[PDB]
Amino acid sequence: IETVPVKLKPGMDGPKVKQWPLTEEKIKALVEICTEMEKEGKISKIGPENPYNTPVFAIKKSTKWRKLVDFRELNKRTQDFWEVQLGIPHPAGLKKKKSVTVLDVGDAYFSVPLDEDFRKYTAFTIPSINNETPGIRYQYNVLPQGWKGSPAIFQSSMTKILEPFRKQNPDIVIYQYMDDLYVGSDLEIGQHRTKIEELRQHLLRWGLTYELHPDKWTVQPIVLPEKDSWTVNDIQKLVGKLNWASQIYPGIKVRQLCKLLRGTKALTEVIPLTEEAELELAENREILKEPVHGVYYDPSKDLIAEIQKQGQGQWTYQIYQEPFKNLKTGKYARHTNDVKQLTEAVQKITTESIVIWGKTPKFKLPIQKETWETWWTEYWQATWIPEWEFVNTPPLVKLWYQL
Amino acid sequence: PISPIETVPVKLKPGMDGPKVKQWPLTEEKIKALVEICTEMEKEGKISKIGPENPYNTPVFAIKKKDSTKWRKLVDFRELNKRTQDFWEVQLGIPHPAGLKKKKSVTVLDVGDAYFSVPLDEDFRKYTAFTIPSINNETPGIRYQYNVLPQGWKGSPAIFQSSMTKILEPFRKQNPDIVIYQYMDDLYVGSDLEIGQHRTKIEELRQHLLRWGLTTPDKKHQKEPPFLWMGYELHPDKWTVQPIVLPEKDSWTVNDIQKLVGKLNWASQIYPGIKVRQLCKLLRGTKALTEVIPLTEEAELELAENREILKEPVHGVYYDPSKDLIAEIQKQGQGQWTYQIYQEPFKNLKTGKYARMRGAHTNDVKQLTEAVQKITTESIVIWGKTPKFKLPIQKETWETWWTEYWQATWIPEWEFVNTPPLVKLWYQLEKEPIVGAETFYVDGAANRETKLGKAGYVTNRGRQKVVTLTDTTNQKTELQAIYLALQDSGLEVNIVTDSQYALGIIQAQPDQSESELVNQIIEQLIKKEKVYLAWVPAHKGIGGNEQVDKLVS
Ligand SMILES: CCCCn1c(C(=O)c2cc(C)cc(C#N)c2)c(C(C)C)c(=O)[nH]c1=O
């Protein structure tokens, strides 16, 4: 087969990201795997004249070790190719479906040779314990998994493969993103599942050996309590919340509410509700359950996601492009391991984000950089990696999104 | 020799070309020295002479070795190096002795003339051309180019290392029982055979090295244990840092104290409870290395304690893959932490130290967790697995903190160990308002040009108090106002502020800070019985906030 030549962004150079230290068990797994990919000719050993590097890890998908390459740098340095030059259009109908199923079609790429002059940029390194030997270095000879260039390049082979299946069920939406296919229908759940098995067989003739329910995605509104007795404290909290909300949702009002908090009163003190505040309250509740008037998705901007830890296994999140113009808010819940849950939450959020916008968000993560870096691998099950940075949640933000 | 291993292809950075530096004319003895060297190199294949066209040149120089009468060939590749491609890093991270399996028998053997034993990419040789000038330069000089890896060129240490590795590969495949560590041009080799089958496998290893152009020490020039290396003293079944003298001095200079801290920090790898906080406070301030620094009382206390731990020699043991690792941590005092890692108590694989602070305000529970994380990453690197931990904190003290703190956190398998000082939470903020406790509505304020500050409060019991502060920032007044409310309040108090900033600091339950204020606030919070802290939107006319806001201006 003939290879599509690939060009970096002019000026800027390949990736030189250093390999994180790995536990012996994962090294063992990576060796086995890579020894086998090398026999099969997908990768080849490389000399010191290759300066570039990309991190690699082992995840568990199922109890077989899988190999995961972190191409975030590459992808960023490659962006022009897989987004502007080629690049899959994203269907608005995908999010509208009753059921969406995600299939791994990464094995497809291993059958297509990678542009010979691009290979050096796919370099990765298996480390050794205590630096006893030098790492083992490889680059890729075929479309690698996790590189946004691979689906970009395999795109036309993918259209060919899916065309019969698309012709026969023209109300099913199929969306490709990185190593995955996203398949959406409105069929009853059993017919949907049957239609996915049919698809697998199409995939199967070409070497490609869980369900979402997006309709039932709805806002996690900033929720206002329904107290029996109110205290100054509770009203103060109410005002703070509405005070937050009002910077996001046009129409929020707090005046009739403050009138109650008049003078210098003890926090623990009960005060009955003004007839007007009682209307204000309900009127604000109307506004929160609805989408934000004035906020729209700009396809040219990065997505961001903030996650707050609520305790008791609950996690709140928002997605936006410009701070606190929220495109979506939600929650996730339930191994009382903080990092495990957090890892789970990021993948759910990332997945929804792909279904909705065909884009992955940069995460603001409420955890110590080093802690997350040491552990996220142990629970990661996706084939991509979002961009993340680390943040100290503003104490106020957390309570305002409680439930 | 020159190894028969294929060459590494090489290039220069893309928009560039080989150097064209001109030769700085040289004295006659230098010219003579150079010629006597290049003739010799040329006879061994190391270099070849060329007649232009070759347009490239890199200057050469000759120097007199030590005090003796050897001349040496210095080449300045400064310019070619700039024009040469980047190579993948030679080898990042160096083994730590604590990570070595103990070995029945070890042999050290070093490659001779290591760089000159490896070929250079033919297509690249022409950029290494240099010229020995003629006397006073009046005639065309003698031009050579390199065939092998030049001392001083940018690619040499990398291409060498990769060569040694391709060469060693086949023998590693056939001899998995045998361990070879590559460091620079040295080779360290160990197995668990007896002096018989070992020396045998060694000579076999040399002969392999020899087919491949790499000469090595014979059984008679092979150095003997103890080995010294990267600042350690490796023995057959223990290891330690190389001996350390804390010098006797009446007066210390900046330079003297830095070297002492470095020697200390290095020593703390295996010597338990080394401290350097008090010696380090001394370095603070912009001083000249020549300057004498009087030791404070605590710094001389520190040097003392340190001097004592160093008195008897301590050593480390090697790693046994079949056993678990344990790490113990102890609070060694003010933001200082010390840890040990052993497999059978208390014979340490290694030890270490953790001083860092993370931000301006933290408590012990955070700090301990940060050390745990630091120790954890270090184990992954050295032994390829996380240690079993032993911490001076009750599972309940740690449980209370984790669940109520906003950040996600987590440490691997651990258990409690009663090694005081234990880490505890020194106060807890109430989770609801307190009934029948005075409510202080506090506030602070500052004029951006003036730098003058007011800080005060109002209470639901009618008290009011405001004070002035000179040269202060808008956020310093907001803490002051909270200190204020804590000073004049009883054992139980509610406090309302509009400062997210103050709220943030206090709600995180600090118990030490870079701020005297925050230390002051802390000392109060510990003296209290219940304190409940809450936040209100500024300038919405809310409750008592309006009043105390009006009073400060
Ligand atoms: C008698 C010392 C045994 C230490 N050792 C070694 C080893 O000898 C060694 C190790 C390093 C990292 C550097 C240097 C130097 N200079 C030597 C080895 C080597 C064969 C790797 C070993 O496996 N086990 C040891 O205990």
Curated annotation (Swiss-Prot), chain A:
Changing residue 129 to M: Confers resistance to delavirdine, efavirenz and nevirapine. Changing residue 62 to N: Confers multi-NRTI resistance. Changing residue 69 to L: Confers resistance to HBY 097. Coiled coil: none annotated. Changing residue 209 to Y: Confers resistance to zidovudine. Changing residue 183 to I: Confers resistance to HBY 097. Changing residue 184 to E: Confers resistance to efavirenz, nevirapine and quinoxaline. Changing residue 83 to G: Confers resistance to pyrophosphate analog PFA. A motif (Tryptophan repeat motif) lies at residues 372-388. Changing residue 208 to F: Confers resistance to ph-AZT and zidovudine. Changing residue 82 to S: Confers resistance to pyrophosphate analog PFA. Changing residue 63 to A: Confers resistance to lamivudine and stavudine. Changing residue 184 to T: Confers resistance to efavirenz, HBY 097 and nevirapine. Changing residue 175 to C: Confers multi-NNRTI resistance. This is p51 RT. It comes from Human immunodeficiency virus type 1 group M subtype B (isolate HXB2) (HIV-1).
